[PDB]
Nucleic acid binder design. Structure first.
Ligand SMILES: [Mg+2]
Ligand SMILES: [Mg+2]
Length: 101
RNA sequence: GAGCUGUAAGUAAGCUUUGAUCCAGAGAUUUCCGAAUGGGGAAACCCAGCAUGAGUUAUGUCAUGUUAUCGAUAUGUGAAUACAUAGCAUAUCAGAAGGCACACCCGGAGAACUGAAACAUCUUAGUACCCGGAGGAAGAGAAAGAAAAUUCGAUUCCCUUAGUAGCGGCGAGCGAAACGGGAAGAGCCCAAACCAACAAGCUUGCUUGUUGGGGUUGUAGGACACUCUAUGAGUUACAAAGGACGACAUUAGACGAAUCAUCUGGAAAGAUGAAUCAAAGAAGGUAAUAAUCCUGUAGUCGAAAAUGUUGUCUCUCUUGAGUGGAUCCUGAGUACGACGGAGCACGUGAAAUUCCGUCGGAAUCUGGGAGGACCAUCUCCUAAGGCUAAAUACUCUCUAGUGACCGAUAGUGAACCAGUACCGUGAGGGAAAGGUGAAAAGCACCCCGGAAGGGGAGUGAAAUAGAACCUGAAACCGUGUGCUUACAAGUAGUCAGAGCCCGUUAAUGGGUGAUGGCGUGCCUUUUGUAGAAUGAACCGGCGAGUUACGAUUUGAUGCAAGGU
RNA sequence: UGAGGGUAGCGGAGAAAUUCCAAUCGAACCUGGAGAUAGCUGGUUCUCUCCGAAAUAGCUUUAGGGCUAGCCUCAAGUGAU
RNA sequence: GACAAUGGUAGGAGAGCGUUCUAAGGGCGUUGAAGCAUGAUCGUAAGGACAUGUGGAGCGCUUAGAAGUGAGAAUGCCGGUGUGAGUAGCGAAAGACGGGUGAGAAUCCCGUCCACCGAUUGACUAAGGUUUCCAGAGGAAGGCUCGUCCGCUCUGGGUUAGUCGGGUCCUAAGCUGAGGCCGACAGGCGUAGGCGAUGGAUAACAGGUUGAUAUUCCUGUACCACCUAUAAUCGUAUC
RNA sequence: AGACUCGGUGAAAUCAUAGUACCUGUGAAGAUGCAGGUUACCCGCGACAGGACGGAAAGACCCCGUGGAGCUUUACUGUAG
């Protein structure tokens, strides 16, 4: 449904109305990671070798039914359908009709 | 069709768009113990034999291969005893054993307390235990039958007959069947009389010994006597047993319609507004309550393959009736009777029909049996050989799905890695356990401390949710404060009431109590309890007239000489 | 007195006491029939309104139990008995 | 609106509140439900609301249905907490001091003096237990107090055989048993052969060493079984 | 040696709520709790044993149950041999 490399649009969250890209999708818990969306402030272990007494800020994963794949030819995040006469499913946006990648 | 390396968190070193992980079918590997099977044993271990093979100049040491016991086909081979037979030595042999679903079924054996208000015949009960046999079901089965009509035409299971006929220290209690309505519904193979061969008789025998042909019943049917047909008919679930070609079902899987913006919020699925799809408003999750966000549902769609169910195509195999009447056949230590027991609903009773142990013991179609002792005529039926599907009883399991069923003392003993800690020499007994948050963002850094544990700062909607982690009751232990008590005899309350400190759901209010009157706790069992008669330390959970099939009366309601 | 063994519950063993057989023996322990049976004891949970008894007779393998009669209760019927 | 009735145990009759669940109609809820806590309120009784606090997502009302439908007692059953009470105990028995160690010492380690067993409270091996043994770090629990200590927790280590005790050797009591003999089934007995040491047979002794092993490891000298080369060889020798 | 004051750890049987006096009476006939009187300021610690019908074991004796069991005989009915 949603994979890494394509834009999204958060529809339901504290950081809604924000585009971005997918970083890494947890497939079992159905959670995706988008940059700049639901960022943390981790109290890191400053006895680690890397830093000197600080607070990390890495993005936190959101569930896959909070992003929605967009093709703004009519300024709209759409849903996905599947067409194939080529031996492999080419992904189709049903609300506009164009072939996306 | 892009992330994966079981719990997996944590790092390490990697693999994958030349399709990895993950899912389904089919083949490969499957150490040692176990029926244990080369011998031994205190299971999971110890000792060997004969063949081929490595190794060493050679023994020691290793790998593969086999070798249990009965049975029954075989080949030998001397039997005590000449012939020859029980013994013995070998080749083979998907032959056998044990495990179970503690369920259902059929046989062998087979109790007790209990009910009878004691108890022995009897009932509990042919039940519980135990032992043997199997099956996907098993058992019964093709009338020596029911029955009294101008009879119908195997068995099995449900409804009714009926708690009626009966049996019963005639006590307690046990308790049918046929008729009638149904679920299901097919019937067939031998033995004998006999004809033909081959090993023993001139033998007298087609009969005996073997093997093929014949032949199956009561309206009496077959040997034998005669003609008139000889290709259509098949089953391998009964009746004899050996293959292909694609239809459909199962174990992976794919597609699958339609919502946008504001208010409160940490977050929209919510209320207020406009839109839409609907053979799809079942259900679950997503930062709260979603027909339209996700996984899906109604509907279509899909098999390289391995089983499974059937259609028709082979292919195997097969004679079908009638009339006659002379002769032969139609299951023998069988049927049945006396003595002793069992079982039929029926307890030796006048006791039929059915099987067991012991002795007696038949008739042969003008025969033999039954119709509840028995006998006589009318009536149905053919005993002493065997094999048979379905309707029926179950559930350790696999897949979809339901519930006026439970919600952590509940429902399984068990939601936690349960028949596990732990108790017992042994068989055997057997509990305790669940919840951070939407997301680990699980408390960086300073400070008292040896550390625990704290208090700030920080993440978070809230840590007064910090792994003693949701809400947090009472008992019981504390710290604070308004009234009060050190001359009094108290089931601790009640009614009358000064003085003091307060100010509610606003009504002739609340807390405290100097002094006066009355007043011997609560249940349970008793003629009668303050009782020195019984029970409870306290607080919290759990903890007892229920359901079924009948009976009778009452209330309702529908019809009413008819109801159902 | 050590070590390895044998006898088992209708039964073993007993220089004999009803003695011992896994801290129990006038007949062991464990699961099953079994939720055995009990005329005998304890227990039996919400509230108000109306009426309100008996502890006697007869028979009992009966005497602290039972059945009918007596006394209470609710509804129908005769209707001053 | 008159006149009437109304103590009550066994027991008969009537009328109601409440709890979980389902069906139908209507409704509140993150501008905060259930649950819990405080209150001076309402009804003839069981019982009903409402007002602030804590709580964080589901719950009541009207009519009818169906019950695992109501707890003060059963020497009731599981869980919690008290009174007895800071009471009875602390499990035979000789300790005293100087030094270190430590946040902390009558208790731990080292030293001197003192006492106790000495046919044993000493030294080796069977039975049984199964890591306890040993060095380095620990102080929450266990130890009848304390603890720096440990038979308790974490990490890393420890058991060497031709000759000792067993097996490749033998048989007692007993056990099992090819054929066989008996028995409703299960199964009981038993001949040849097997199994079975607490017994018979059976070739190695001193000294050294580790933080933990020693007839096992290595120092010096041995011995029994087997195999291969071998020479003096004896020959129907011999097995 | 235990007890007794101090330092360390720290149980148990028992228990309806307790601010828990005596005398002669009454009473289920033996009263801390009732009636009438008399003494009695509030709270501890060491002792003793008259009472709380003191604590522990649903009397252990004796009647009762148409309860159970073991043994016994010329009780009844059976059975191994
Ligand atoms: Mg049977
Ligand atoms: Mg008293």
């Amino acid at each position: 449904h949603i994979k890494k490399g394509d834009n999204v649009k958060v529809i339901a969250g504290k950081d809604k109305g924000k585009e971005g890209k997918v970083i890494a999708t947890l497939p079992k818990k159905d959670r995706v990671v988008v940059e700049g969306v639901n960022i943390m402030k981790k109290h890191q272990k400053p006895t680690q070798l890397n830093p000197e007494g600080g607070i990390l800020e890495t993005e936190a994963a959101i569930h896959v039914s909070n992003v929605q794949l967009l093709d703004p030819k009519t300024n709209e995040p759409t849903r996905v359908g599947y067409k194939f006469v080529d031996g492999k499913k080419v992904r189709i946006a049903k609300k506009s009709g164009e072939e996306i990648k």
